[PDB]
Amino acid sequence: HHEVVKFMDVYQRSYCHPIETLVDIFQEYPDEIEYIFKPSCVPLMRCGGCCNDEGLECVPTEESNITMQIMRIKPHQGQHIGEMSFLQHNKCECRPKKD
Amino acid sequence: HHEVVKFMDVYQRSYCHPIETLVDIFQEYPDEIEYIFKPSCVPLMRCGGCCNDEGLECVPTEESNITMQIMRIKPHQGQHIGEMSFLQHNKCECRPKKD
Amino acid sequence: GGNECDIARMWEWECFERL
Amino acid sequence: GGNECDIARMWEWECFERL
Incomplete structure (x- = not known):
């Protein structure tokens, strides 16, 4: 354990801001099931x-786009490297809930 | 936009490992509903x-525990600072799915 | 210094005291 | 340099080639 954390630090580091987060390819691209992605x-x-x-x-x-290298594979076939662009968040902000 | 990221970097940085992640208090403590936490x-x-x-x-x-400072506030009442311990992940690893 | 505590902004100490 | 490609281990280049 690292003892009790400082209050001002918990809010500053927790407040809605851009942080490193891993996104699933299958969650963004629902029309790509036959080609296993490496990494997924x-x-x-x-x-x-x-x-x-x-x-x-x-x-x-x-928002913004970012290109990445993905290795698409297929059962009983082969493998290949392709270019895939994903959408990221540049700026963050809090607003009243709608739905 | 930057440019096409290196393959070896996408896998090394995306592979199941301990990364900074924000957890909701209401998701861990489902009994504390009458006392709004700041930050939540x-x-x-x-x-x-x-x-x-x-x-x-x-x-x-x-796993492990980590103490933090949280301000509990209740409607029509007052405010107060308390010590709350949360559970974190020290080691990560991949294993075959079950359910 | 007065009452510029925005709900969607970094609520400093003063804003926290008077939430 | 053999066949020590663990499924739950950092699959280096050689392991990726022969997946």
């Missing part, structure tokens, strides 16, 4: 944590 | 990403 996930900068109030929601305000 | 979430080192095969699963092998 990719690291993307997304917004995570919580808001200041219960009636708010941590969501992104800006 | 806390940063904990958990395992995230994906495994080498589809039949595997990224899960932790070891």
Whole structure:
């Protein structure tokens, strides 16, 4: 254990901001099931944590694309390296919940 | 945008390992509903990403506790600082899925 | 210094005291 | 340099070639 953490630090580090998060390829690309991806996930900068109030929601305000190298494989066939671009979050912000 | 990321880097950084992840307090403590926490979430080192095969699963092998400072606030009442301990993941590893 | 405590902004100490 | 490609281990280049 690292003892009791400082209050001001828990809020600053937890407040809705862009943090390193791994996203599943199968979750973003639902039309790619026959080609096993290696790796099956990719690291993307997304917004995570919580808001200041219960009636708010941590969501992104800006976006961007990032190309990556993925090895697509298929049973009883072969393998191959391809270029895949994913969407990331550039800016984060809290806003009142809708649905 | 930056450019096409290196393959060896996407796998080494995406492979099931301990990464900074924010956990919701309400998700861990389902009994504390009458006392709103500030912040409502806390940063904990958990395992995230994906495994080498589809039949595997990224899960932790070891654990630990971490104390933090949280401000409990109740409607029409007052506020107060308390010590809350959360569970984190020390070691991560991939194993065949069960359910 | 007055009352510029935005709900969707870094609630400093003063804002926390008067939430 | 043989066949020690563990499924739950860092699959190096050689392991990726012969998956």
